[PDB]
Amino acid sequence: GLGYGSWEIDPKDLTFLKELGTGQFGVVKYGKWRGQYDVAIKMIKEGSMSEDEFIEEAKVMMNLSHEKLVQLYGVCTKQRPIFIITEYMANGCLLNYLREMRHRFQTQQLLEMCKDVCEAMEYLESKQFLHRDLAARNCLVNDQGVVKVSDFGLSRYVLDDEYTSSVGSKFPVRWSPPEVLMYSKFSSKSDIWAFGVLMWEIYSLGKMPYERFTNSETAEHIAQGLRLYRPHLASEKVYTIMYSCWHEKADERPTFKILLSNILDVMDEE
Numbered sequence: 001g002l003g004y005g006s007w008e009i010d011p012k013d014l015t016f017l018k019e020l021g022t023g024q025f026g027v028v029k030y031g032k033w034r035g036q037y038d039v040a041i042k043m044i045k046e047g048s049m050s051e052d053e054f055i056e057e058a059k060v061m062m063n064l065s066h067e068k069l070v071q072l073y074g075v076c077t078k079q080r081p082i083f084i085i086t087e088y089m090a091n092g093c094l095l096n097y098l099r100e101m102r103h104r105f106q107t108q109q110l111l112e113m114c115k116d117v118c119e120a121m122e123y124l125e126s127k128q129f130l131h132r133d134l135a136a137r138n139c140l141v142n143d144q145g146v147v148k149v150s151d152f153g154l155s156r157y158v159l160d161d162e163y164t165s166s167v168g169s170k171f172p173v174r175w176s177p178p179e180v181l182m183y184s185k186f187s188s189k190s191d192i193w194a195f196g197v198l199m200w201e202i203y204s205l206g207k208m209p210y211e212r213f214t215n216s217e218t219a220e221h222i223a224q225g226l227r228l229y230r231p232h233l234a235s236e237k238v239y240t241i242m243y244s245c246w247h248e249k250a251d252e253r254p255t256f257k258i259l260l261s262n263i264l265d266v267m268d269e270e
């Protein structure tokens with residue numbers, strides 16, 4: 001209506017139904033838009049986010065639509081705190097989902113989770129959009145068990161310096177290639193590295209990568225050319241795919257298109 005751009009949701013159209021959890025920017029709630037449509041409502045804690053830069057980028061993120069990307073519906077801008085309105089994912093965080101041993105996953109289900117994420121990332125790569133923080137903690141699971149990539153590019157708007165620089169206490173060291181840790185070289189190939197680590201998280205049922213090491217020890221390990229090794233649930237062919245993501249030379253890592261082809265080959269063979 002009158003006072004609203006295409007990227008802007010009237011918060012008066014929201015019904016709040018359940019508290020889901022709290023993350024980086026604060027509380028997430030389940031609700032309805034205009035009485036009918038399931039939404040997630042992220043209440044952005046004051047001072048957590050570069051809000052004007054985020055809102056400008058929200059316009060670009062609105063046009064990123066792929067069935068394996070958590071859809072951005074819009075933002076509630078006129079207020080404190082602002083709200084980010086997204087596709088509701090009833091089964092929550094992929095990391096928590098993997099750690100629930102009751103699911104008793106088949107390796108075919110784990111490969112489907114890798115394929116879901118890989119389709120999302122191939123789409124983002126096709127639009128020259130980097131995720132910049134790909135990990136199981138940034139994937140969500142819907143009521144049908146479909147995995148979707150969430151919070152793509154949002155790390156750019158985090159004001160907490162512990163999260164944003166390589167030797168920050170909250171930087172994702174364990175998902176980062178050597179060139180990111182050594183001189184902050186972000187590229188398509190740092191998303192590829194992260195995707196390899198996400199495949200390892202899935203096949204490890206949500207173990208922490210390098211779980212016996214500190215961030216400092218992890219950085220030294222990977223800089224010296226040492227790597228994660230094969231999760232017990234990963235076949236030789238699955239391990240070959242995740243390992244291909246960790247070539248010391250970034251230009252020798254595959255694309256998301258090549259990874260998707262390799263994952264579809266294994267699905268057919270295994």
Ligand SMILES: *CCC(=O)N1CC[C@H](Oc2nc(-c3n[nH]c(=O)[nH]3)cc3ccccc23)C1
Binds near residue numbers: 021022023070090150
């Ligand atoms: C692993 C990530 C994490 O810790 N979270 C805590 C806050 C969030 O919880 C959460 N989010 C959603 C959701 N749906 N669409 C979104 O953009 N976020 C759904 C959901 C369902 C059940 C429990 C938590 C939860 C993520």
